[PDB]
């Protein structure tokens, strides 16, 4: 015969053989190679997801979902359900009337962070061809106990690592999405300077004659304190 | 009046999923992706790994030359899928 050092291996399964393309093969069937973790069967051949005991692990791809209740509200404890163009935005109640618009730049910055995180998790593939057998037909004593212990300990360690990774990434996601909004708040405060004050809630209480052009100038970044300065009569 | 107001707000979804932070067991989020695959198609795909269906023969039985496995003679495989219905029809053999 011929004995070659090789990557071919053997698997014990009763599943049907079909016509398709899939990198990962497990005794139950072929499974997607995208998701970083799997809960089908420990036996694998090819670029298969790492096996963990957990059924569902949820990675957040969005900010905290805070509901909302005349008057308008801000980021302090309210979240606009109607905002659909962007994640973060400006609402206004000027003399012309109430209106709504969205800040594109901050939304895409936060989304880019989330995208990079996702890219670092989902894309990776672990290639493993020939391994030990975890399914034992008889009782063999010594050698069975050792190899069973090996796979059990490996599964447990990988499961803890997966839980740590998911929780850490989720916490970072939520903190980042909140921080982006807080950054928008501070930028707007700097731009307004003397002509505004935080009204407790996210709504900046601004005291100067603002048309729709004023709100537009705030968002695109041209509100000049000097032009509207004389309205400093606020205190008096 | 000459006093306007500008509020800074975020977006919310009517349909909220729940994830786990480091601290809080349950925290609501807008869109959550699932990192664990928990299903199977049901069929073993032939591409792109060469699969040889063992049918009625174990690999050792095909190696020996048990007549049912005459077809498997001189074959190259990447994954020999041994089957539970394996049976031998030849001299009783024990392999240390």
């Amino acid at each position, epitope marked *: 015969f011929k004995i070659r050092s090789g990557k071919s291996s053997i698997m014990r399964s009763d599943a049907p053989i079909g016509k398709c393309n899939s990198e990962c093969i497990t005794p139950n069937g072929s499974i997607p190679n995208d998701k970083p973790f799997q809960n089908v069967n420990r036996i694998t051949y090819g670029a298969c997801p790492r096996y963990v005991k957990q059924n569902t692990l949820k990675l957040a791809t969005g900010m905290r979902n805070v509901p909302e209740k005349g008057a308008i509200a801000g980021f302090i404890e309210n979240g606009w359900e109607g905002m659909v163009d962007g994640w973060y935005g400006f609402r206004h109640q000027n003399s012309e009337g109430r209106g709504q618009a969205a800040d594109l730049k901050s939304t895409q910055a936060a*989304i880019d962070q989330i995208n990079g995180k996702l890219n670092r998790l989902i894309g990776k593939t672990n290639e493993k061809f020939h391994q030990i057998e975890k399914e034992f037909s008889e009782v063999e004593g010594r050698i069975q106990d050792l190899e069973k212990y090996v796979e059990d300990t490996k599964i447990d360690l990988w499961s803890y690592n997966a839980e740590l990774l998911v929780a850490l990434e989720n916490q970072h996601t939520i903190d980042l999405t909140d921080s982006e909004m807080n950054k928008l708040f501070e930028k707007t405060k700097k731009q307004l300077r003397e002509n505004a004050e935080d009204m407790g809630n996210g709504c900046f209480k601004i005291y100067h004659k603002c048309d729709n052009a004023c709100i537009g100038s705030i968002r695109n970044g041209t509100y000049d304190h000097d032009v509207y300065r004389d309205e400093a009569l606020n205190n008096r | 009046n000459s006093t306007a107001t500008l509020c800074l707000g975020h977006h919310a979804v009517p349909n909220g999923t729940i994830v786990k932070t480091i601290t809080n067991d349950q925290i609501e989020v807008t869109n959550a992706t699932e990192l664990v695959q928990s299903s199977s198609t049901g069929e073993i795909c032939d591409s792109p790994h060469q699969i040889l269906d063992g049918k009625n023969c174990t690999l050792i039985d095909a190696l020996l030359g048990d007549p049912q496995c005459d077809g498997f003679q001189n074959k190259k495989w990447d994954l020999f899928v041994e089957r539970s219905k394996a049976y031998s029809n030849c001299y009783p053999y024990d392999v240390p």
Partner: antibody
Amino acid sequence: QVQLVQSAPEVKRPGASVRLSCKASGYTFNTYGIIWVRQAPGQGLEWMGWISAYTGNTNYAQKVQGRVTMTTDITTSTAYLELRGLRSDDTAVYYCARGLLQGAVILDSYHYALDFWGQGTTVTVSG
Amino acid sequence: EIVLTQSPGTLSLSPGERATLSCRASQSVTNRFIAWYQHKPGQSPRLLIYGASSRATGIPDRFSGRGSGTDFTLTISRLEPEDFAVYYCQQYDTSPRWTFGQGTKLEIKR
């Protein structure tokens, strides 16, 4: 359908400045970026820069960082590439393919690749 | 940068034969990036394989993509006259950047 229509062929004198236009139809313009890649005669495709329709952010190639300015116009879905200080090596065919999805989180790799391509505009620079 | 090297630079193959095109990465990259494009002479370049193995819409199923880490391959079966062209391979940097490939020419028929 999703379609990209470029500008017209141009002839320029060394040291001049050229502006190239790329127009998008069908898909929502603000969601995807526009990415410019050029092919010199007898040369492989060469990336130049990326402009976003959502954000104003631009990233340019190191070889043409100083000389390249890229702009976008929502009305009506028009992307402009301006190359200054033209040199003989800049003679090439310039393409404008659709880029990354700048509106939402991304899991399909389809948005992370250039998919719909324009016809291309030939710019020949010589005295 | 992440320079990409394309193996064999020119390939000659009669119609109706399988073909394998190689793209070798200087550094390891996730399978998410590294897509495969087609350029036909006098025509705008076309996208064949996006991601690593996914088939773009309207692309014949004969085209298949595969690979990991440093090595990525494009496999074409039942080679027809539509297929003969130049092929390119590219990826993405976190700050948008797209390094392309040298170019493999499928000049073919004997």
